[PDB]
Subunit: 269 residues, 5 copies
């Protein structure tokens, strides 16, 4: 059977199949995913009147990210349970084509709209010094878009064409480093003028941002991190990838938004 | 196989079929579609108290457009994934009649109610000079309705009867030019009396409106933009059409609404 | 094939079947239906603080009508697409019994709870003179209930027993005329004491009410308006009936509610 | 065919089957059911600021009842349409085991949480004289729980074991009479100290409570009210039972809550 | 038939099958579950302005727990009805593999985000004396996470490997005792400085917490509480487990949250 330009999850499910644990876990971690986003949406809305009017735009953007995040991730959780059916004879879940092939695309388009908002909301809490608001914003939005788009193309060839998969991943990485660079400037200029408490938080935000955002490219390579025909090129790699995505999503959106809220309160009078 | 007066998407899916990329992409772009609309709905509601009471009717109408836009576009996303099933032997998605034929109708009825509201909300932010409120409104609502209705009829014959398809498309275009004419007047009269900042925004609103609204008729012809049996009369044309629709929808409703909100704030005291 | 006491839509779908246009259109018009109701619900809630506390009960009842309307009309839209499946050989949608027979019952029960509220809410905007509030209310609620119940019974025999269908329809009409009579009194007494502007609106409300409410009995007979084996006793009659219902529903609930809101503002200080 | 300890609806659907009217009606009355509850939820929330802060706890509990009532009753509606499929040959709906057997359980668990809240909310509007708040509450909550639990057990044997069905029904009745007794005291003590207007309402509340609550045990016996192999032990009895439940539910929750709201306003200053 | 590392519910359903009562009851108790959580969500939101701003964080966290709880518990409910189909011949519900194997995982990952919030919210109502806020928080969050994770692993081997099932259960218990220890300290330090009324409530909160939290490990062993081939290793054990979980969930989240709210009011001025 020819799957073509499909994610490696389909190849594992079509050949070896998934064990009760592998399948169930992936379902639970994706379910917990959209559950956290709807819980976060409620939090950011109920805590809007806890910061000065000038910082409230941060809670609004956090809520915007949560909504879309819930819908896309909710669909992604359905794309999984629908693409794999249990085989009584062997007692493993195999690719059910009638439910469509599983694709990490829904999550990539969730980033396309999130990335821009996540990078833009910090500009409503911190105050730039030598950098222009419009300038920083435009850089984030451009590099952010190019990073997602290029990566979205590569993930389609993560099996069919390993070369194209890495080339696009590399190009994407380029824009990723540029974002890290601009964000570093914003953090530094943000620390200037605020209390030691506010600086302490911005320091934590930078570490969170650095680690959480690095997990994404990690999940992208997950199936080949132990080389071809490696330990991760199995159902173990599938669990690992979806787990890492879930950890990254919660950290980069929910926790990131909570810290911005805490900073907003610290600067509130 | 007899399809009758059906959209060209069904003909491609019934003959050639769709590749993993073509099918998946179309699913992601439609999913992102309704996701953005629900995110926008939340934004316009949370920012109502950011403008004077006289301009708040603009945020309310934007929210009204988002709601309906979310429901119709959601149904459209389901109409896709349901109409095409994966074939293991060849590894392509083919027309699954049990899920009903795919039709871009749901999107046409979303416009019918939207168009009127989108054209009417700007009349709550800007002040007419040499034009009567009721007069302008009646023109938008009439031409707007005729434009959608005529187009809705033609799209059914985009394959079965190319002649009827173009004739209706032409008639529709007539009312489209009339709307562009009236909107141009509204923008000009709107600039008179407001600050240079407000004028700057109205200038951007006009450009956005002109480009975003022109994309629709482009998506209408998409399958024949490279002539019959052309490059676009394939799964590539299907992807292009649904992508263009999504770009147009986000720009004409969400972004258009954000700019109106920004102008409202600029005129707020 | 034995259908028994079923709506004529089932007979057309079981014999002739539905064309792509006939089926798709009916789906779009029903979809637009519930979409408008959810858009209206949001409008009436966001405009509650736009009228004096004494008139706000009108917006609340409008919202109550929208909710129930959305659910019932949504269920109806799903009932249609479920009752008819596409036949590849002939290329037409035929009755799929596994999805249950299509019935206009969900809409008849939507009226049962709506009619009472729609007639009751106007009594919170206008002021009676010689008529008692309780008296008028009791008449509307009684005649309203009997009108819906009797009609609900008749619609089951619109094919199986043409006699019973007309007899019940006639009895129903009796209570309909009584409602028109009481509503006429309410409008007259309502005009006395209010400004010419308020009177202008009440005049428009009466015209809207008269036309929109008359469309329902029109949709009831739709299949026989061109006599037995007539032009309307086809898929054309099916489209016509569902279209008329949608126009009537939007006019009698949403537009009727918007006009009452405008009158409330006119009388607000 | 072996059904075991199943509701009589399954036996009628498995043997005689259901006519278009019997099936459709049951679907409409259950649909109207959950529709009314969501409409009521919106009403109680939008009218919270219409009574003094001390009475607002009544609207909150009414809203709590509506929510859970909507979800359960919605699940009960789905349980119906899924358990019975149309047979083309005979033209009647028969038991479809793949959709699970129909059980009035979802409604019995809705009461388990509702009953306690419905009996408890009246204690926030009226003022006891010689009776202790905590004492009355504890009695309602205990007798209320025992009444539902015992009844829930009996309904499982309404066909399999007529003896057990009546024994449990009898035990349940015991706790029902005790509730009627305590509620009567609460009404009397409630009338003392309030205006004649408030007393008028409490009188209506007592009548509503007495009739609406008595309908439940009536629906419990519905299939045997005309003795075994009687007129009601048919599809007619099924329609009657689900109709009675719907009337009881709307009256005991929505109407009961509206009257409490009216009384709260009467006592509000 | 090979099930592998699956929950015991699947083994009972695959061999003996489930009776109408066993299946129906499990469905009702799980349905009531998510219904209570959505009812609680509405309560905590509508009662936020009933306590001083400093205690409102307790209501917000209660609402956060309700949301996630509703989504996960809803999924768990669907997982049940989908995994077991009725067999006409024997008249019992058997494992339907096409609907996936039933797993109590969705409820476990629900505790993962809940536990931390439930232990953290009490720190916003009570005031520590000799214990550091950050210190107590970190202990709860760590032990809480390890307790859930370890237990989540063990529940997969509750049949396949009884040894691993008990070992993990034991390790989990270790962290459970540590949580009970820290919570005991928090309660004691919380009682110091507050009124006798507040102390009375904290005493009730401690009893509720102790009993409700102990039920979980009880549901974990439920199938072996009467040893292998025991009375509980049947459909009776399945009902018991899901019942206990539901009672524990309502007590540990909803009731626990209500008491914290009542304590907040007691300390409010
Ligand atoms: C994170 C992204 C990882 C990319 C880094 C790995 C290779 C990049 C070098 C360019 C790829 C060219 C190698 C082609 C090949 O056949 O190997
Ligand atoms: C391609 C898809 C791109 C869609 C991006 C966002 C959609 C989310 C809708 C919400 C829009 C919020 C925009 C915003 O926050 O603007 C800040 C404003 O200028 C300060 O007053
Ligand atoms: C045809 C489809 C109609 C769409 C109706 C949708 C929302 C009603 C809100 C309309 C509010 C218009 C403003 C009224 C006004 O005059 O202020
Ligand atoms: C079929 C053809 C449908 C054409 C409907 C187009 C515009 C009507 C807009 C209606 C907006 C609601 C009325 C507002 C109003 O009446 O304001 C006073
Ligand atoms: C609003 C005004 C529409 C009136 C006439 C347009 C008639 C257009 C009919 C085009 C049909 C062409 C055709 O069917 O050719 C074979
Ligand atoms: C190709 C896909 C581009 C995707 C994201 C670009 C980000 C654009 C998001 C902008 C939406 C909000 C907006 O347009 O606001 C403008 C405002 O003037 C600012 O302050
Ligand atoms: C109350 C009167 C209702 C009359 C019932 C009816 O119309 O029955 C006609 C009969 O079935 C025609 O053969
Ligand atoms: C109570 C209402 C009962 C109404 C019963 C239906 C009356 C009716 O018209 O029955 C027609 C049938 O075809 C033969 O009479
Ligand atoms: C069974 C058919 C009847 C279903 C009724 C539907 C109404 C439900 C909720 C709105 C409550 C309306 C409250 C009316 C206001 C009373 C008042 O304000 O005095
Ligand atoms: C077997 C038939 C039983 C007959 C029951 C009659 C009285 C019911 C409840 C009394 C309990 C009083 C509530 C106790 C307060 C705690
Ligand atoms: C299976 C037994 C089910 C019995 C269900 C009925 C009894 C509990 C009802 C509501 C409790 C709500 C929490 C209220 C507890 C605090 C008391 C208070 O605050 O007054
Ligand atoms: C107050 C609390 C009552 C609790 C238990 C009473 C149990 C006694 C009721 C048990 C009913 C079972 C029964 O009647 O058995 C049917 C018999 O087998 C037909 O042949
Ligand atoms: C308390 C719950 C105890 C439930 C025990 C039910 C016993 C029962 O009702 O038995 C009837 C009959 O024996 C069945 O065949
Ligand atoms: C696995 C991760 C599970 C995390 C659940 C995150 C859900 C909601 C976040 C609510 C905000 C958390 C509370 C912060 C309150 C605060 O720190 O306010 C000062
Ligand atoms: C996986 C572990 C979850 C427990 C940790 C839950 C942490 C939830 C978010 C913590 C947070 O938001 O921290 C606020 C500042 O500190
Ligand atoms: C990382 C932790 C994964 C370890 C879980 C594996 C396990 O618990 O093994 C028990 C059983 O013996 C295996 O077949
Ligand atoms: C301290 C936290 C984790 C310690 C992990 C301890 C690992 C305990 C392993 C227990 C286990 O998985 O047992 C193997 C199984 O019995 C084979 O048959
Ligand atoms: C909430 C969503 C977030 C934070 C998304 C972040 C996405 C990235 C940081 C993506 C980066 C990638 C690369 C650097 C290379 C491979 C492809 C990507 C897109 C995964
Ligand atoms: C949010 C929805 C919007 C802005 C819809 C706009 C629709 C049009 C501008 C449609 C125009 C068309 C023509 C000019 C010719 C072909 C048919 C149409 C309807 C696509
Ligand atoms: C929003 C719902 C509304 C306004 C419903 C109105 C319903 C009617 C006016 C029904 C009238 C009928 C007759 C006069 C005879 C035939 C049967 C009816 C019920 C369609
Ligand atoms: C909104 C829910 C309400 C008011 C539920 C009420 C339920 C009862 C009054 C039940 C009574 C019963 C008996 C007295 C005997 C038979 C079994 C019951 C539970 C139906
Ligand atoms: C609302 C969710 C709550 C309160 C969850 C609580 C969970 C536990 C107390 C779990 C404890 C366990 C053990 C002590 C051993 C067996 C495994 C667990 C996780 C069930
Ligand atoms: C004030 C607004 C100005 C914003 C400037 C830049 C932000 C928009 C980002 C969108 C750019 C995406 C373009 C994609 C290029 C095509 C990718 C093809 C693959 C190489
Ligand atoms: C996609 C084809 C249509 C492009 C429309 C461009 C509009 C430019 C108007 C200036
Ligand atoms: C209080 C006094 C009146 C009680 C009325 C109860 C009515 C019960 C009806 C049960 C259903 C009967 C159908 C034939
Ligand atoms: C106050 C902010 C810092 C929080 C730190 C306190 C601890 C909370 C996070 C706990 C993380 C648990 C992760 C478990 C590790 C892997 C589990 C292995 C399975 C045996
Ligand atoms: C301060 C209030 C204390 C009570 C609240 C806690 C409520 C939980 C009640 C415990 C009862 C659960 C026992 C269920 C029986 C199921 C059979 C178990 C078989 C081993
Ligand atoms: Na599956
Ligand atoms: Na598909
Ligand atoms: Na309604
Ligand atoms: Na269909
Ligand atoms: Na309920
Ligand atoms: Na059915
Ligand atoms: Na949860
Ligand atoms: Na089932």
């Amino acid at each position: 059977q020819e799957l073509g330009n499909a994610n490696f999850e389909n190849f594992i499910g079509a050949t070896e199949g998934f064990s009760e644990i592998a399948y169930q876990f992936t379902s639970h971690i994706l379910t917990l995913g959209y559950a956290v986003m709807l819980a976060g949406l409620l939090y950011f809305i109920l805590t809007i009147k806890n910061v000065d009017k000038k910082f409230q735009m941060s809670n609004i953007l956090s809520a915007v990210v949560m909504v879309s995040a819930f819908l896309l991730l909710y669909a992604q959780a359905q794309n999984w349970t629908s693409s794999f059916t249990f085989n009584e004879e062997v007692g493993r879940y195999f690719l059910d084509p009638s439910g469509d092939l599983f694709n990490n695309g829904y999550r990539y388009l969730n980033w396309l709209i999130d990335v821009p908002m996540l990078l833009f909301q910090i500009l409503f809490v911190v105050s730039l010094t030598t950098s222009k608001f419009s300038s920083v914003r435009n850089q984030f939005w451009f590099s952010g878009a190019m990073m997602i788009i290029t990566g979205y193309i590569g993930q389609f060839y993560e099996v069919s064409n390993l070369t194209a998969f890495l080339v696009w991943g590399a190009i994407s990485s380029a824009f990723f480093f540029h974002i890290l660079w601009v964000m570093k400037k914003v953090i530094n200029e943000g620390k200037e003028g605020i209390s030691p408490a506010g600086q302490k938080i911005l320091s934590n935000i930078w570490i969170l941002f650095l680690i959480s955002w690095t997990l994404y490219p990690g999940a992208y390579l997950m199936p080949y991190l132990t080389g071809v025909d490696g330990f991760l090129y199995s159902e173990d790699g599938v669990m690992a990838r979806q787990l890492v995505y879930t950890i990254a999503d919660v950290s980069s959106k929910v926790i990131y938004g909570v810290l911005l809220g805490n900073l907003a309160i610290t600067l509130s009078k």
